[PDB]
Write a protein that binds this ligand. Structure first.
Ligand code: HEM
Ligand code: HEM
Ligand code: HEM
Ligand code: HEM
Ligand code: K
Ligand code: K
Lengths: 156, 156, 156, 156, 156, 156, 156
């Protein structure tokens, strides 16, 4: 079904953000696992999987709309060097992701692509839930102290 | 455990090949699904998952050896425009992957990193299994005809 | 709960499209079954049942909004004479149906009938899935040949 | 129990034919699997297993009759280069085998070795069933065409 | 996948050793069963089956590497005339097999056919397990006496 | 089966290292249990058992190769007196152990004892898993602080 | 709980005896397994395990009493070269062990370490059970002859 060219451009932009997130979260997961912070590693692994599922749906939607999914262009991964930085890197990424999702939803609405809008809204709900998690972790580091926070994330 | 710097470079190079293949096979899978060739789409999805698992193991090995996994530098995806082309693109990628695997194994052997060698040998066994599958599909297209071959791959 | 009069008019227009689709898809189903193409016959039956469920929900919404559902005025059935024509007739109907659905959503949004919009978005998702199915069938006819395509739809 | 010398010679000749068939069918099975014709590959594997079981019983009978089973002399394997040739190679071998079985049964009857006769009759029944299969496959190649015939033997 | 021509020659040489062992061990098994030494007969049967499985894997590897498996050129079976000779004939055969396996692995390693090497290594582990069994049996014949050793192998 | 004399000397050297590790880990386990650090105690017990299993396989291999396993010449145990030193003592022992394993594998490869090499490779994989655990634990003490680290290991 | 210094020295002497017995019984077990005498191998393995469990209770008691368990000094292993010698070597060790256990119990009684006495009495009961087994095996060899005795210990 021939989709709107600019919708497909927006879907490829969102897809690009998801492809960054997949790799960034997966590396952060395996870094936390390497450091013995297995609760963080497991949670971050599930974040990466969730972004994979979003990327899948975007690819499927782009192809149904007769566009070409772009899995070639990979933007800048924000890789931290310690737990505080890694969480903030994920948070910085997610805030760019939600800006772009809101702009894509506007455009879907204007060309009456209400199904693509509904998909993007679902992805946006998932990204805001990730923001909630991240902001909460950063707040907990302040409330319990960094050593306690990390200790609490050693064991699953 | 401090690894050989050149081993780590080889492992990042293999990881780079797996990252290409993850994206190429995943896109090929969703294209075949979109065209109604669901048996191909499902098979190619499982190939993409297999590459994801190899990438995971490579990432974990690099970190254990105190290297920096490189998920940033994505190489060229070989995307076909029809089934015959897509299969040949996968095969071309696999032949490059196995050449690089052999060179990495040689080096691991020379520096006595026998555990990295064992990992890469397992990955090489998986890639040769993919080559077998790909060569066989191309052969079947010649034996049964393209139209029959595609017909046989419509339904799961 | 007294609804917007033009919303009710749009809902009755969507219902009119669903009532055409029920009969067209049911007759095509039974034609394919009579011809021994039982996989087409069964899939088309399920498409007709889906339209019946949509019509049900539209009738219920119209009555809740204190309008009069119009089940009396049946528009033109597009009945094919062979498989390719029947599929294209279904696709022509669906493209008209999605056009009307989008115009109805616009009007729901403008007068703040957000629940009617949500119902119509869900129906639109179902109709786009049928379009995907129909487009894929027509494409498969070109990839495997009509004779193979019909062969693959003889048996459930 | 001391058997007739010529009966034992016949049994060793039948054994020699089965030993050829084991290897021929096993190699054909693995050729078909390598080509992705897994249904032919699996069926031919079962034909090879059936010949293994006959060879076992012949070896046991020879040893009971105080003869020396000959597993050393292996006659000529008829290996085809395509599916039609492999099937005909199997058939030609089976037609020789049943001729030799009939001559061995004649001699068993003459010297009153009714138990060896019964064994050979059971083996002959298996070989005629294999002939039925082979002639049927070659007939189906003619009825449905080679491309369809091979298509129908891709998947188990 | 086109393999190294000398690798393929080594694989056919290993395959030829497996084919001798299949026949030698099967015949020894059935001789022991005929003599009422059913525990030896059963264990020897399972040795033959294991060699059949190795032969299968070699045939498959050879075909994947685009060589022609040789099931035609059967070398010399070493058939004993009593239990002590049969075991020693098996051991003599296994010691030649392991020599040939080691030389094949050397070459696989030199030309980087690491998957063929892995297969050969697995086969060599099975062959060394058989050597262990055979050497132990000959030691037991000394330690318990021939009469007791045979008595211990009458019943399963 | 007569083994290479120097291979057997390497195997006895690896055995000696496992024999040290069995006792060191078992004592460290029981010290941690006595101190109320039961999670360390249990994990360290499982490390000792794994070393026991490696020593068993080494003894079995040495005897098969017709060597004399040396369980008499116990080398120096590295017994720590607090948690951090105990972990570092285990790490120091493992680093010596993997150095010896690599030298033994080199020699196995040179004399073509590929089964001994495969055994030592499996043992090296286990010791590298232990190194990974140990390095992770020492890193955790730095990240969460010694008092929290110990706290987290009081309870199973 | 600070224990009597000479009690602790006795406990370490008993521990030393158990440590010799662990290795001596484990090697004898694996020697019998290598020779095909698996019932002897299995029983001697279970004797080695029993001594391992005694050593564990002695290590735990010494630590509780605030002594230092000595796992470093290994006394002389009495390794036999044939079954009779191996059993007698085990018996000679056990008789030295029970002599040392009796002197240890005398001293525990004198200084009122009744709990250590109870542990040593339990170990003494196990060692006297092992002496029973060993004396009985040596007696059976005399009654049934070594060849029959070994025959009866081939299969588990
Ligand atoms: C560095 C790149 C990637 C890595 C390391 C990775 C890793 C993984 C792993 C380990 C799994 C679990 C496999 C299993 O055990 O079953 C998985 C699942 C999955 N991946 Fe990826 N992946 C990557 C990229 C992608 C991309 C780019 C996509 C899609 C565009 C994707 C789509 C999926 C899906 C759909 C699943 C299954 C999720 C489910 O459980 O439903 N992955 N991935
Ligand atoms: C040509 C006109 C129609 C035909 C031939 C037809 C046929 C059928 C058939 C054969 C079934 C399955 C019943 C069963 O076996 O249990 C069914 C179910 C149903 N029909 Fe129709 N129908 C028609 C029109 C309609 C209309 C106009 C509506 C609503 C406005 C409707 C609503 C439904 C509903 C709600 C179901 C139950 C579906 C479910 O939940 O499984 N049908 N119809
Ligand atoms: C090229 C030579 C041969 C090959 C590749 C081969 C291969 C095989 C394989 C793969 C199996 C199934 C094993 C399993 O997974 O359980 C099998 C079974 C068997 N083979 Fe062979 N074989 C060969 C020769 C022989 C010969 C020469 C004999 C007898 C003289 C024989 C007797 C049997 C028997 C009795 C079975 C078990 C059948 C059953 O399931 O009852 N085979 N063979
Ligand atoms: C030559 C040195 C040793 C060898 C080869 C050895 C071997 C073994 C083996 C093979 C097992 C069974 C493991 C399994 O499959 O789960 C085991 C268990 C065990 N070992 Fe050792 N071991 C040795 C020394 C020791 C020592 C020195 C101690 C204590 C100081 C010890 C304490 C234990 C314990 C407590 C068990 C568990 C027994 C049970 O409850 O089942 N072992 N050993
Ligand atoms: K705390
Ligand atoms: K006896």
């Amino acid at each position: 079904m021939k989709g709107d060219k600019k919708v497909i451009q927006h879907l490829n932009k969102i897809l690009g953000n998801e492809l960054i997130a997949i790799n960034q979260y997966f590396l952060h997961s395996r870094m936390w696992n390497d450091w013995g912070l297995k609760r963080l590693g497991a949670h971050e692994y599930h974040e990466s999987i969730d972004e994979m599922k979003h990327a899948d749906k975007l690819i499927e939607r782009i192809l149904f709309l007769e566009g070409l999914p772009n899995l070639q262009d990979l933007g800048k991964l924000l890789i931290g060097e310690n737990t505080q930085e890694m969480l903030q890197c994920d948070l910085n990424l997610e805030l760019k992701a939600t800006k772009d999702l809101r702009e894509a939803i506007v455009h879907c609405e204007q060309v009456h692509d209400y199904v693509s809008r509904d998909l993007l809204k679902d992805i946006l709900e998932s990204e805001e839930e990730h923001i909630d998690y991240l902001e909460t972790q950063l707040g907990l580091i302040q409330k319990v102290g960094l050593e306690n926070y990390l200790q609490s994330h050693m064991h699953e």
